[PDB]
Amino acid sequence: GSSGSSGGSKAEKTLGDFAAEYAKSNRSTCKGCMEKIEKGQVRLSKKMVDPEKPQLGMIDRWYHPGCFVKNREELGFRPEYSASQLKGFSLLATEDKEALKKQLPGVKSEGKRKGDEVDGVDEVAKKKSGPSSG
Ligand SMILES: [Zn+2]
């Protein structure tokens, strides 16, 4: 016996599958990092079916705002959808809102980048130690 979700939402231009709101309780746990979700800390959910538990079917998971971004592609979040389109965002506080906008700029062509690394640059003999045998 657990209080179920009331069937009666008011939205016209909002995405259902995607919803964001304050973590009412610290019961749920993220799967991207496998870490409990501290109460109060903003959180989001995505309507999808668990591959490990097909019996349940259409379920609702939860992932920290930071995980939602990193796994924005893996989860299946297209650029056509922004943070302002997250059920609840509008309700959230401006301060928090911007926090999500700065993370999910919506449409943007972001590409991977590479830097540099050491090749060797070995020098003449120097003072060092050595392993031991048996
Ligand atoms: Zn997480």
CATH number at residue 92: 3.30.1740.10
Which is it for strands 15-22 and 86-87: parallel, antiparallel or unpaired?
parallel
At 87, which helix (H) or strand (E)? strand 86-87
Q: Tokens for 37, please give them.
A: 């979700």
For residues 29 and 37, the answer to whether their CB atoms sit within 8 Å is yes
Going by the DSSP 8-state scheme, the letter that residue 81 receives in this structure is -
Method: NMR
**Residue 30 annotated as binding site:** yes
How many angstroms does the Cα of residue 38 sit away from the middle of ligand 1? 10
How many angstroms does the Cα of residue 114 sit away from the middle of ligand 1? 26
**Residue 64 annotated as binding site:** yes
Residue 132 is which amino acid? S
How many angstroms does the Cα of residue 16 sit away from the middle of ligand 1? 20
For the chain, the C-alpha Rg in angstroms (whole number) is 22
Q: Tokens for 102, please give them.
A: 């700065």
Query: Which protein residues have their CB within 5 A of the ion that is ligand 1?
Result: 30, 32-33, 64, 67
Q: Cβ contacts of residue 87 below 8 Å, gap of 6+?
A: 9, 11, 14, 15, 16, 18, 19, 20, 21
How many angstroms does the Cα of residue 8 sit away from the middle of ligand 1? 28
How many angstroms does the Cα of residue 122 sit away from the middle of ligand 1? 43
Residue 60: which domain range? 14-103
